Swiss-Prot record, chain A:
One of its GO terms (cellular component) is phycobilisome. InterPro entries: Allophyco_linker, Allophyco_linker_chain, CpcD-like_dom. It comes from the Bacteria. It is a peripheral membrane protein. This is Phycobilisome 7.8 kDa linker polypeptide, allophycocyanin-associated, core. It holds the Pfam family CpcD.
Swiss-Prot record, chains B, E, G, J:
NCBIfam families: apcB. SUPFAM superfamilies: Globin-like. The modification N4-methylasparagine is found at residue 71. It comes from Thermosynechococcus vestitus (strain NIES-2133 / IAM M-273 / BP-1). One of its GO terms (biological process) is photosynthesis. Belongs to the phycobiliprotein family. (2R,3E)-phycocyanobilin binds at residue 81. This is Allophycocyanin beta chain. It comes from the Bacteria. Keywords: Antenna complex, Bile pigment, Chromophore, Electron transport, Membrane, Methylation, Photosynthesis, Phycobilisome, Thylakoid, Transport.
UniProtKB/Swiss-Prot annotation, chains D, F, H, I, K:
Belongs to the phycobiliprotein family. InterPro entries: Globin-like_sf (IPR009050), Phycobilisome_asu/bsu (IPR012128), Phycobilisome_asu/bsu_sf (IPR038719). One of its GO terms (biological process) is photosynthesis. It comes from Thermosynechococcus vestitus (strain NIES-2133 / IAM M-273 / BP-1). (2R,3E)-phycocyanobilin binds at residue 80. Its main location: membrane. This is Allophycocyanin alpha chain. It is a peripheral membrane protein.
Length: 66, 161, 50, 160, 161, 160, 161, 160, 160, 161, 160
């Protein structure tokens, strides 16, 4: 059940001379198992979670999950 | 990721002004309340599992949502629901210890509404359930600490709503 | 795309310790989700998938 | 089911189903009619299995139906029997599917977490399901009882 | 992914009632056609590359699209086109074996149309090409199995369009 | 083999074999005698399978035996027939094992790279194996030919 | 990793000869014993935790090792010990199902004695514990399957020793 | 310990101990004598706490000491009483140390795994430890009972 | 704040605050009145601290206020004195917070990049803050001046 | 990334034609100006720090933006602002050397609007600042080179706007 | 091109073009006259290079144009010469660019996949391009031939 997510990762830890746009703003497909762990990590990093969609799977399915 | 002290100094920093006597009054009030907050946190932690069990029993159990085709039917979904309530309680006590709602917004409510609607989790039912948690917690921590617990519980309710 | 092919191959070299042309019947990795797509845009996901 | 399992493996391996996997789904197809028959008799004797197996569990566990036990009182014992009925339904699904996938997803992912939140003892739940297995096996023929017993065995092993 | 059996069992599970008599009949029907499904899968597994080659030659070759500026010109784009066709054929055989289009929905069609539009892939050309694949594979497996195969290939066509 | 594949998957997920996998290996065990019989007739007729299939392959792909082709000259033709014999042997191994694991482990891992170093065309190798499949299927009974032909089908699919 | 069938065919593959009649005989013997192997694996899959519990009680409990300072003392160390017994029993059922001890040597007994020496685990006591496991599992699966389980359990003991 | 926890955190931060962390160590040093006296009275009343609290636990949970329960039989009941003595011992260590580090390292980590293998219900273990906390509270002054009660609270919360 | 850091650590390990971490925030709560007093005298004497320290800094290295120095002219000197006031109130925020997190966030990350973009010498900034520390120490009691001095020391180290 | 030569040969490749004499003329023209492009790049590489400093002083400094609450306030924010200006100038010199705007269009401009709007960074102020950079860099490199650079600076301005 | 590749590397390491890199950019631009002259020669003789080299390829590898081969028939042979024409065009582009990234971007990324899908022999395509290189040696002076030869070398090396 891959979740399509859109998120930001502003970082005050350092000022980066190399490219940072790629990591800063991104959309990724995160599987259902990973999403809670990733949600907690990005929320801890303090980035704003702009958007979430259920790219694969169905909103509710008792069995037959991906 | 802020507490009461961080919020006070950051607000003064946004103004650009130095620490004011009114700002220090806010800091004094938080310090005076600090010990009360700490003991409440210990009680919440020790009885956290029981708080969740009692609140779920009084709010969600023996109802249509736990009945088949109700979004908490199936063991996997029931486990996720109780886990989410556990996390709500833990982040609530973090916010209570901080004396600020910043943690709730930064680490809980962000994306929570979007994810819950994406999966169609019943947001009204969750709000009712955490209100049940709120009264159980009020009984355990006491009236004084319960009022502080209440504002952060209601803050989470507002974010879900 | 030039760099993308290099980085895909490099992920093979680190994860499997060698280029995988020996020891695979067919190439069993769809790198298209990582390449010009957001499905495995996270190399943090491509490495994990491998 | 076996078919979806084989397709999942083939999709990961990026290959069409190997002759071995095709052979396995063949055999599942051939025994599908017997699997349906086993499920039919299980649902026919749905109530009998749950009722008498639950009574056997209560006989071996006085603590369960005693004060301080989870299924204490008539209403609580009724809800416990409801859970036993749910597990029987899952077992019939699993027999029809030919694999443990529906049983695992519907009623075994976090079974301990759910029961811990409820306060219910997991080994006692396992004993109840064992009693259900015995009753179902008596109803079934020897060959049929063996097929259904395997799914019951997986459930009790997960309960442990 | 959901098999035909998985979908039927899932519907019964959502109801919470045991397998209905109509549900049993659905399961029996899938078992009846299962052996034919296995045979067809074996056939197009052996001739997968040939099927793709024939379809590409039938519609995608010696045309403006393969000539310069037509999106299939350039070596990398041609390789991407042929592997897309083998992707379509392989997921089509997965769906045929499964007896349901759930695999196509979840693993293929999602984002496929939008990404093709962003890249500039000619969706009409791809739809015609997989139609040519349908003709070739139907000849190889047989009319009865091909008719069953066509519903899933057409499902891919509709999602692309 | 099916047994080792089941054990490998179970070990990867760190759980005992599910009843589905156990039933799978049980049915394979039951049909073992038929599998051995199919392998026995294949090895009994190995010589003619290779010989006449090779002749059909040469007709199908004249460029192979033409000047400049990989199997040009009697010596080169002899070694290609030897390769066909090797793949027949692998197919008998795979049928006995019940899985394509031995075929893959012995003659399909890096098959593309080995042949490109040799200069030999992989699709032409696939055509030769298709001819071997036809001869073997004719020798076998209809039910037996379906299984052995499926193993040949995996080999040609990998060659492609 | 190998099994009986894989070992037989690999032995013939090194020669390059087709399967001769003696090799066929070895394969026939494995097929003859396979049914009881499957039954035994299903039996101890059901009783896995109980087998570990019985063996631990038989030799590892109410002894100095589980008393303070004994190495099974401390809750972590107790969990690690029962985890190792779970490991050994699961790999024993793998080896019994395969009909070959290659799994044990490949995944269990390589670098096991050295790690135990570094950890301070008593190799002798582990050998005793898995001997007790061997008794319990033999009783559950039956006598002849008990002989088969025993050879692989003894193999594990020898590797530890 | 306060010292070990501060030094762990500073080691991860690769810093000489922060002045505030040193201040906490100073205050822990000064309060150590009160901690020692609290631990002293607990170990002096070891016997009364265990027997009184255990009888409270069995009243609260008659199921565990009933036949068909984990502790039924004087010997099994005695070993559970030993477990209660063990946990009181760990709590005395924790009171002296100033952190949970000793408590969690010695026990309370793999607690669910150990007790699942043993068959005991870990919430019932938590109830016994709660009873110990009540008895210890009675034996301590209100200030002292608060300090010891926190460590008991951590133990019961981890059990649940 | 230490409260913030404790919550972060517990959140990382997905645990409620341990009794030791709770005791840490208890101690900081009681320390708050002392910390507020130190910050209050700093803000009461903010003008005096800035002025004489600035004159001392210009006396120390007059190249800053000489022609060719970054702060040559009355407007430039005024803005640098404004920066000194900025850093002093940063230190007041750090003192009440109890840790240096507010100071770092407001005015440290990228310190070299900011002032070298401006063309200002960071060693000269260090001497200016040193003068501020000396004047602040005079206005603080010796026991109190240790606490404020630590934040000043961190700031000058970060300036370098 | 694309350049003048790459653009010319890419256009010929889309045409499917070998290099025409007109295409060779375009390449000759780029070669003719490549000499001036190199020395302009050397000049602003050496003076890059001065250029950013001067532009920041001209428009960004002594304003409410760098005063408290203006989003450029805070040392981290100031460092990020000058870092972005360094990025823009470095990418501008890359585009000037190449003779093509592809690097700006792909590496820089895409997504920059979304990130700036999300963070609250004032795009109008950034456009004003890089306009000031354009004036300063034109003075340093010279008039002809300033014409070459200014188009790429304006390209970035339009992307931000 | 050399300019774009230098810019790419400098972009990755976040550095303005180094003085030596600037020298290389300047040098390539200046010698662009010679580059264009070489490309002009090749496009002037596109017809004979392809025609003569393709005939040499057919003679060296008769199997490609034999019956049952990829190039059998005048239609297929016309397409084969068309492919050689495409590769010569890419080589002229690469000479003009001064780098092989245009050649790779257009016609060496996935040649194995495309040609194997077509059935064409990849080593045979490499040998045809070798024939084009040998034909090129006569057309270009020794100093010029070395420059064009390197681009031909990359094409054949990637092909194999
Ligand atoms: C319980 C009151 C209700 C309920 C809940 C339910 N939630 C999910 C799934 C998710 N919940 C979250 C939310 C969070 N993730 C976090 O890390 C945190 C802490 C900051 C929260 C609050 C997420 C990310 C998911 C999806 C992934 C996951 O399961 O973790 C489910 C599962 C749905 C499904 O399986 O398809 C459920 C059932 N359900 C109810 O009926 C209650 C009203
Ligand atoms: C019976 C063998 C054991 C036992 C059980 C017991 N269960 C409950 C309450 C609930 N049980 C469930 C279980 C499920 N929900 C599911 O979706 C599934 C899988 C499909 C299962 C198994 C639920 C949801 C509840 C609560 C709400 C509801 O009824 O829906 C109780 C009552 C709790 C109480 O004591 O108050 C009991 C007693 N009790 C035993 O003694 C057995 C060992
Ligand atoms: C000639 C040296 C060898 C050979 C080749 C051969 N190729 C084809 C068919 C095609 N070749 C291409 C090649 C390219 N497409 C590109 O975009 C590029 C880079 C710019 C190249 C090189 C393509 C696209 C085709 C498909 C047909 C088409 O153009 O539409 C054939 C024809 C195969 C057929 O049956 O149709 C042949 C024969 N054959 C030989 O014998 C030589 C060794
Ligand atoms: C062939 C029929 C036509 C064609 C296709 C073409 N596609 C791409 C790129 C992509 N193709 C896919 C498709 C899939 N990805 C998957 O994981 C699956 C499994 C279900 C499929 C079907 C995707 C996602 C992409 C984008 C990512 C990427 O770039 O690889 C290209 C490449 C475009 C380019 O410019 O490089 C092409 C050419 N082109 C045609 O002309 C045919 C009509
Ligand atoms: C106690 C209130 C409940 C209870 C417990 C019970 N425990 C056992 C057996 C064991 N308990 C332990 C515990 C520990 N080992 C440790 O190292 C630590 C930390 C220092 C602890 C807490 C162990 C090792 C055993 C095994 C026996 C042994 O020590 O050798 C039993 C006996 C189980 C049996 O039937 O054999 C019981 C009954 N029982 C209850 O009813 C209470 C709720
Ligand atoms: C139980 C019978 C005896 C015992 C065991 C004990 N073992 C460990 C630690 C480890 N054991 C292993 C062994 C394995 N790892 C594996 O993956 C497998 C199967 C492939 C095996 C057999 C390993 C790696 C460890 C260390 C890592 C870990 O903690 O798991 C301990 C812990 C020692 C410690 O203090 O760190 C113990 C106590 N103890 C006994 O008293 C029995 C005789
Ligand atoms: C000071 C002792 C030395 C010195 C400094 C100097 N600074 C400036 C200009 C600025 N300084 C800042 C500093 C900050 N901005 C922040 O947000 C924070 C944290 C809250 C700090 C510390 C800024 C933003 C400026 C720019 C002007 C503005 O504020 O808008 C100058 C003026 C430089 C000029 O020529 O314009 C000077 C001189 N100079 C010295 O000699 C001292 C050693
Ligand atoms: C200066 C003119 C203005 C200004 C800027 C400012 N920017 C940021 C943060 C970011 N800027 C970028 C932009 C880029 N990243 C890149 O890699 C490139 C080159 C391709 C560019 C142009 C990004 C990605 C960020 C966010 C991540 C990061 O920190 O780098 C900030 C910080 C915002 C914050 O508080 O987190 C600021 C202040 N501010 C101004 O006042 C000027 C008008």
């Amino acid at each position: 059940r891959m979740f399509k997510i859109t998120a930001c990762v502003p970082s005050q830890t350092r000022i980066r001379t190399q490219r940072e746009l790629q990591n800063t703003y991104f959309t990724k497909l995160v599987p259902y198992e990973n999403w809670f762990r990733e949600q907690q990590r990005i929320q801890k990093m303090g980035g704003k979670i702009v958007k979430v969609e259920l790219f694969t799977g169905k909103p509710g399915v008792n069995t037959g999950l991906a | 990721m802020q507490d009461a002290i961080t919020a006070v100094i950051n607000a003064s920093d946004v103004q650009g002004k130095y620490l004011d006597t009114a700002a220090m009054e806010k800091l004094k009030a938080y310090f005076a309340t600090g010990e009360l907050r700490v003991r409440a946190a210990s009680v919440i932690s020790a009885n956290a599992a029981n708080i969740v069990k009692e609140a779920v029993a009084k709010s969600l159990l023996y109802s249509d949502i736990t009945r088949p085709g109700g979004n908490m039917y199936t063991t996997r979904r029931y486990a996720a629901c109780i886990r989410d309530l556990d996390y709500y309680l833990r982040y609530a006590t973090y916010a209570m210890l901080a004396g600020d709602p910043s943690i709730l917004d930064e680490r809980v409510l962000n994306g929570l509404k979007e994810t819950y609607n994406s999966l169609g989790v019943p947001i009204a039912a969750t709000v009712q359930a955490i209100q049940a948690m709120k009264e159980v917690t009020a009984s355990l921590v006491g009236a004084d600490a319960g009022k502080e617990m209440g504002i952060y519980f209601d803050y989470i309710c507002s974010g879900l709503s | 795309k030039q760099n993308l092919q290099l980085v895909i191959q490099a992920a093979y070299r680190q994860v499997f310790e060698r280029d995988v042309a020996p020891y695979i019947v067919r190439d069993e990795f769809t790198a298209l989700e990582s390449k010009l797509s957001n499905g495995e845009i996270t190399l943090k996901e491509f490495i994990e998938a491998l | 089911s076996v078919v979806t399992k084989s397709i999942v493996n083939a999709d990961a391996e990026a290959r069409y189903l190997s002759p071995g996997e095709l052979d396995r789904i063949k055999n599942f197809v051939s025994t599908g009619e017997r699997r349906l028959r086993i499920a039919q008799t299980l649902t026919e004797n749905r109530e009998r299995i749950v009722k008498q197996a639950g009574d056997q569990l209560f006989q071996k566990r006085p603590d369960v139906v005693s004060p301080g036990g989870n299924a204490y009182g008539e209403e609580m014992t009724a809800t416990c029997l409801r859970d036993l009925d749910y597990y029987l339904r899952l077992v019939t699904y699993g027999i029809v599917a030919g694999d443990v996938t529906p049983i695992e997803e519907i009623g075994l992912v976090g079974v301990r977490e759910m029961y811990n939140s409820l306060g219910t003892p997991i080994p006692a739940v396992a004993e109840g399901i064992r009693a259900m297995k015995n009753v179902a096996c008596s109803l079934l023929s020897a060959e049929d009882a063996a097929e259904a017993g395997s799914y019951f065995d997986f459930v009790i092993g997960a309960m442990q």
